[PDB]
Design a protein around this ligand. Sequence first.
Ligand SMILES: O=c1cnn([C@@H]2O[C@H](COP(=O)(O)O)[C@@H](O)[C@H]2O)c(=O)[nH]1
Ligand SMILES: O=c1cnn([C@@H]2O[C@H](COP(=O)(O)O)[C@@H](O)[C@H]2O)c(=O)[nH]1
Lengths: 217, 218
Amino acid sequence: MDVMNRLILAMDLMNRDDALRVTGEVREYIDTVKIGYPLVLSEGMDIIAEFRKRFGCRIIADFKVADIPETNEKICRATFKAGADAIIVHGFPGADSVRACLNVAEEMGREVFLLTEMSHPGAEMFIQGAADEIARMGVDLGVKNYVGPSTRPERLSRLREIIGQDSFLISPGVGAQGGDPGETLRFADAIIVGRSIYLADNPAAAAAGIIESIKDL
Amino acid sequence: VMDVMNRLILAMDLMNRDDALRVTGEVREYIDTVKIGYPLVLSEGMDIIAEFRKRFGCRIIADFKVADIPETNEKICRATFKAGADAIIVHGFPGADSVRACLNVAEEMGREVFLLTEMSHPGAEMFIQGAADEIARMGVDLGVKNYVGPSTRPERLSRLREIIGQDSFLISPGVGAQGGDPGETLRFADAIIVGRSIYLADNPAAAAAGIIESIKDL
Ligand SMILES: O=c1cnn([C@@H]2O[C@H](COP(=O)(O)O)[C@@H](O)[C@H]2O)c(=O)[nH]1
Ligand SMILES: O=c1cnn([C@@H]2O[C@H](COP(=O)(O)O)[C@@H](O)[C@H]2O)c(=O)[nH]1
């Protein structure tokens, strides 16, 4: 995936008007938008097509897919039907649940992003201890896209080591959660940024500022 | 605790509005509690919850297996309860803060959180099973009163019931299609969750009635 400015906008505003207005204000800086349940459950899945129609941006559905294989398949199908280019799936539920997602993605010409370790403090309780193994599982399954924590650069670096330089890695937790844009890009191909941009007084200036700080990258 | 009619919860995972409504309507006399998940919600919209409330006199459990960071979990719960869901199912593996975020919204909005400890599918044995007992204990420490456990592993369901105590409410999926037995599951769970065995049957009503007849003494 070729992400403009190595910056993915996490559009978690829950109002259609605000989401569209803010995204439009920073459109010149991005071409990849991560849409999650906050916006989808508030405005409906048709919002995905609206974004593609207005911005032509690629859409990553951050649905943290974490159900049994049968249900995961249905979730992916509904998501790709809505126009999502990729979907984020949890690895904690096991290999069969991830495979179900990979099957649908292959069938519809989309990509699966495997979330190995999360960025919040609670991730240390159960996810972190299984993260490396989840990453190895991704490798065994042929997964090429991963999600790792900006909040723990050493952990993000370990994830990169496991998956190799060829795999694609995106990373959330930048800004609001404490992650540094430049440091995160030492290991991730692209950073995910939400609040630092969409909650800023001037979203455009916020995005421009982040890009300025990583201009050499 | 919620009074689930016939201790049977319908997992309505059909993705077509017309079919979902038809089938739910046909088993309406046997079930007053319906679990709606993403297969239907992502296909027909959150308003489907509103439509089910209007058409049937059923409680709604949103099986969204909430598994994000605290900030995002709060937003998901708010949107879900705003839509009319009585309760929401949340994953415990992402940690205490993520669960607490859901509990806080449920408390302020007057709704309930169901904590999913162990899952019923084969893959659950890779990472979830090993953390299940601790996730359950965490739920008890956090004040969680409603839980979800696997019918496919009676031994595990029994242990979960022990950890949460007799006062906690426990519902269990994996019955029918996945192999779980209704009666045996009800030895530990307050109610069983059944999807495909009912909604894919030539006669959903007869399928539901059959399951209920098999557990009549319970
Ligand atoms: O480990 C993870 C996985 N996903 N996200 C998601 O990435 C975005 C981060 O946004 P923020 O910049 O506003 O913190 C949100 O949509 C959140 O659900 C995380 O923050 N951490
Ligand atoms: O551990 C779990 C948690 N949730 N479910 C959900 O419960 C329902 C089971 O339906 P079934 O009777 O068709 O297998 C589906 O909605 C599925 O996502 C499980 O099966 N196992």
